[PDB]
Each structure stands twice: as C-alpha cells, then as structure tokens.
Amino acid sequence: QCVNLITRTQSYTNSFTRGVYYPDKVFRSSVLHSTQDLFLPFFSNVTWFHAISGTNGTKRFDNPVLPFNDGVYFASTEKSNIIRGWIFGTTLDSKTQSLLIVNNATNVVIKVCEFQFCNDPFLDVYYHKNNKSWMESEFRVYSSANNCTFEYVSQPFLMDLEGKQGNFKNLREFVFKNIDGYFKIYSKHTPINLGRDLPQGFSALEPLVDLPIGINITRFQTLLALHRSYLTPGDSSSGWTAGAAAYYVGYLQPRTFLLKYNENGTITDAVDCALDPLSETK
Amino acid sequence: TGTGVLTESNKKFLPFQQFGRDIADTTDAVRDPQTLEILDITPCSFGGV
Numbered sequence: 387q388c389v390n391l392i393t394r395t396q397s398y399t400n401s402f403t404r405g406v407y408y409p410d411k412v413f414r415s416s417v418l419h420s421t422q423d424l425f426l427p428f429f430s431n432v433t434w435f436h437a438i439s440g441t442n443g444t445k446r447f448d449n450p451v452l453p454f455n456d457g458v459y460f461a462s463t464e465k466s467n468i469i470r471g472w473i474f475g476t477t478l479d480s481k482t483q484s485l486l487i488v489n490n491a492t493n494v495v496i497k498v499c500e501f502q503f504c505n506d507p508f509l510d511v512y513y514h515k516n517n518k519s520w521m522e523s524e525f526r527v528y529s530s531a532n533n534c535t536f537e538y539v540s541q542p543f544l545m546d547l548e549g550k551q552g553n554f555k556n557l558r559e560f561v562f563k564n565i566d567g568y569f570k571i572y573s574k575h576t577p578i579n580l581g582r583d584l585p586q587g588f589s590a591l592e593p594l595v596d597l598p599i600g601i602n603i604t605r606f607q608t609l610l611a612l613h614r615s616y617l618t619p620g621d622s623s624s625g626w627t628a629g630a631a632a633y634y635v636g637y638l639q640p641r642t643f644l645l646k647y648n649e650n651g652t653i654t655d656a657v658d659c660a661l662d663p664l665s666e667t668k
Numbered sequence: 669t670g671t672g673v674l675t676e677s678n679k680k681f682l683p684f685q686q687f688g689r690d691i692a693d694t695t696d697a698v699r700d701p702q703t704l705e706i707l708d709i710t711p712c713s714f715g716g717v
C-alpha cells in the first residue's frame with residue numbers, strides 16, 4: 387500500500403557558497419585554475435524542505451517529486467535512521483530505468499532497475515526482539531521490480547555520529563550530476579558546529595564515486611527511513627514517531643568558477659564569475 | 669610518458685589526488701603508481717654549448 391508520512395513544508399533560504407566540487411580526478415598544487423562546469427551559483431535559492439516525519443496524519447500525498455535540471459546540490463542534517471538515500475529518474479515507473487540509492491548502516495547499495503512504486507518512497511526498519519534484526523521486503527514497500535541491470539555495493543556513505551552534535555554534523559553534501567556518460571556523486575562530512583542551516587565558509591566536495599552511467603534524469607526525490615527507537619509497536623501512531631526530517635535542495639546551472647587550491651591540492655576556495663561586477667572582474 | 673630525474677619528494681599529497689602538476693601545465697610531481705610515494709620529476713641537466 388502507498389502511504390505518505392512526511393509533513394513536507396517548503397521554506398526559502400539562501401544558497402551561500404556550498405556545493406563546489408573537484409572538476410576531475412586530477413591534482414594541482416597552489417594554482418588558481420578556473421573551470422566551466424555545472425555548479426550551484428552563489429547566493430542562490432535553496433528550497434528548505436523543512437518537515438516532520440513519522441506522521442500518520444499525512445496519509446494523502448503532499449510531497450511532489452522535485453526536478454533534476456542541470457545538477458542538484460543536496461544537504462541534510464539527519465542520520466541514517468531518518469534519511470537513507472536519493473531517487474533519480476525520468477518517469478519513476480516500470481517503463482524507464484530508475485536509480486534507487488539505499489545507504490545501509492554497514493554498506494551502500496545502488497540499484498538501477500525498472501522499479502514500480504508510487505511518489506512516496508520510504509523504508510520502515512525495526513529490530514524486533516524475535517530476531518533483533520528484521521529485513522525489509524521489496525515486494526511490500528515497492529509494487530514491482532523488473533529488469534534490474536546495475537548493482538553496486540560499497541562502504542557506508544554516512545559515517546554518522548551517535549551524538550547530537552555529530553547528528554547535526556552529518557552534512558552529506560552529495561552533488562549529483564550526469565555529464566559525459568558519468569553519474570558523478572561527490573561527498574562531504576563536515577565536523578562543523580551545530581546551527582540551523584548551511585553555515586559560512588567553503589569546503590570542496592571530494593568525489594565519492596563516479597558511476598559510468600550518466601543517463602538523463604528529470605525527477606529527483608529524497609528517500610527517507612522511518613525513525614524508530616527499536617521498541618515502539620508496529621503499524622500505529624505510537625509506532626513511527628514524529629521527528630524533523632529536514633533536508634535542503636539546491637540547483638546547479640552552467641557556470642564558470644575561479645578555484646583556489648591550498649598546498650594539499652584541496653579546492654580551498656571558489657568564486658563565481660557572473661555573480662556581480664566584482665565577480666566578473668576577478 | 670616523459671624523460672627526467674625521479675627524486676624523492678617532501679610534499680604532502682591529498683589521498684584523493686593522483687599525480688602532481690605545476691602552474692605551467694607541467695607534471696612536476698607524480699605519485700608512484702605501484703606504492704604511495706611522491707616523486708619529483710627534475711628536468712634533465714640540458715643547458716647549451
């Protein structure tokens with residue numbers, strides 16, 4: 387059965403200077419190299435999808451599937467107990483290949499398959515005392531799966547910290563893009579202090595993986611997991627508990643940047659060109 | 669591919685990074701492909717006569 391559980395509320399914030407990655411797997415030391423590639427423009431709009439999860443009162447769907455456009459910059463503040471991946475596709479049905487990303491507590495599973503499911507993806511996890519480890523069922527949550535073609539497994543992308551400070555630290559800055567047959571996904575995990583949203587400063591996004599697929603994507607969505615205390619009952623309001631499943635979204639556009647590398651070759655700075663007259667001058 | 673002198677390097681390498689570079693597009697360093705070591709490519713001593 388298809389059910390919705392997220393109280394998706396769309397507020398607006400500024401993009402500031404977050405989401406610029408390393409253009410290619412090439413090192414440079416102490417150079418002011420300048421690039422031209424899809425990136426999140428500075429001081430842009432971020433649709434803060436502030437929300438409360440674990441709510442049975444939102445049974446009707448209220449979260450539209452966000453567009454993919456020319457690159458999506460993503461950030462979150464939730465552990466693997468809340469958010470567990472991203473969904474990409476063109477029609478998000480069994481007619482076109484759908485990319486489903488699941489981030490297990492011990493591994494990462496990426497599957498491209500003709501998944502048939504509704505517009506409310508979720509994963510309900512609970513360690514019942516009968517076995518202390520219960521496995522989810524694809525047939526229950528998802529309607530169908532046909533002609534699965536690509537499967538990839540790796541280590542956890544979310545080295546989540548149990549502490550609340552670490553819980554806020556988990557800024558999984560995952561730029562997703564499809565260029566030259568390449569689904570490039572970068573990574574970041576800042577130990578930055580807790581706040582409300584994207585703080586100041588800059589930190590480049592190192593390549594998490596470069597899948598050799600790079601197919602066009604139209605709709606992008608956030609796959610979240612049902613947060614539970616491993617002791618609450620099942621299908622009840624006293625089961626899935628309320629919690630803030632906040633996740634932000636950006637949008638990449640074609641843009642030229644002036645990078646700046648430190649001694650280690652990390653991109654320690656990036657500036658835009660078409661931002662302002664000073665940016666064009668620089 | 670190149671010709672030069674492979675010398676030990678005192679420069680730290682970011683683990684993500686593969687091979688060195690200089691401002692004038694020159695490969696002035698290279699991580700050893702067999703094991704994680706950084707080797708500076710010193711130009712051969714050619715001057716003139």
Ligand SMILES: *[C@@H]1O[C@H](CO)[C@@H](O)[C@H](O)[C@H]1NC(C)=O
Pocket residue numbers: 481500532533
């Ligand atoms: C196999 O993949 C194709 C996509 O090229 C899809 O149209 C088809 O439904 C899948 N299944 C079978 C049995 O062909």
Ligand SMILES: *[C@@H]1O[C@H](CO)[C@@H](O)[C@H](O)[C@H]1NC(C)=O
Pocket residue numbers: 649650680681682
């Ligand atoms: C970066 O380089 C500086 C100086 O070369 C050094 O002090 C610092 O420890 C390096 N950082 C990393 C992460 O390698």
